[PDB]
């Protein structure tokens, strides 16, 4: 019923999942499918390059919040928070947001604490979602966001 928040769920936690295991889930997705395989295809895309782009920053911010298990993962929404949400928001943002937290998806999966990714998916999807949800309506959604990284055939 609250379709952007399922949707939402769905393409960053697959995203962490994926980068954390390597492997393409080959299940379906829920509703809006078309849409959600697009926003996926994207933030592979263009989230990989932002981690590389940003690779020392990553690993300092990594290095400061030393995620160890569950009690560090919930101290994360806070922080999200307090650098995410409080600032202008563009997609940019939301992709360093959703690569952070990929980046941060491979370090649980390195030191064996697999089982905090989808929590740590729910947490930045509730970040996401529950503090911009006006922008992101006025966006048009993952469907913005598609569009938005579009990138034209080169002729040739
Ligand atoms: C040009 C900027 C990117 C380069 C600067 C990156 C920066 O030095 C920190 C390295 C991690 C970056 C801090 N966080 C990361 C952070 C904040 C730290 C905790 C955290 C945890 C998870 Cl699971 C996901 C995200 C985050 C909040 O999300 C961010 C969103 C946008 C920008 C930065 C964010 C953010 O600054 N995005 S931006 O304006 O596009």
Same mark, same amino acid.
């Given at each position: ?31 809006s %499918?078309? !849409? ?5 295809? &994207? @933030?592979?895309?263009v =989230?990989?390059? +932002?981690?590389?782009?940003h690779? $020392? ?29 409080? %600032?202008? !928001? ?5 992709? &360093? @947001?959703?690569?952070? =937290?990929?980046f +941060?998806?491979?370090?649980?999966? $390195? ?11 729910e ?17 048009? %959604? ?9 990138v ?5």
């Open positions: 019923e609250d379709e952007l928040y399922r949707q939402s769920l769905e393409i960053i936690s697959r995203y962490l999942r994926e980068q954390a295991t390597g492997a393409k889930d080959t299940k379906p997705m829920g509703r %499918g078309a !849409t959600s395989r697009k926003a996926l295809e &994207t @933030l592979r895309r =989230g990989d390059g +932002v981690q590389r782009n690779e $020392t920053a990553f690993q300092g911010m990594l290095r400061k919040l030393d995620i160890k298990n569950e009690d560090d993962v919930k101290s994360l929404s806070r922080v999200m928070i307090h650098v995410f949400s409080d %600032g202008v !928001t563009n997609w940019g943002r939301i992709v &360093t @947001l959703i690569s952070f =937290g990929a +941060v998806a491979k370090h649980l999966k $390195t030191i064996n604490q697999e089982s905090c990714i989808e929590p740590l998916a947490s930045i999807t509730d970040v996401l979602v529950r503090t911009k949800r006006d922008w992101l309506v006025k966006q048009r %959604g993952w469907d913005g966001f598609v569009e938005f990284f579009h034209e055939d080169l002729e040739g």
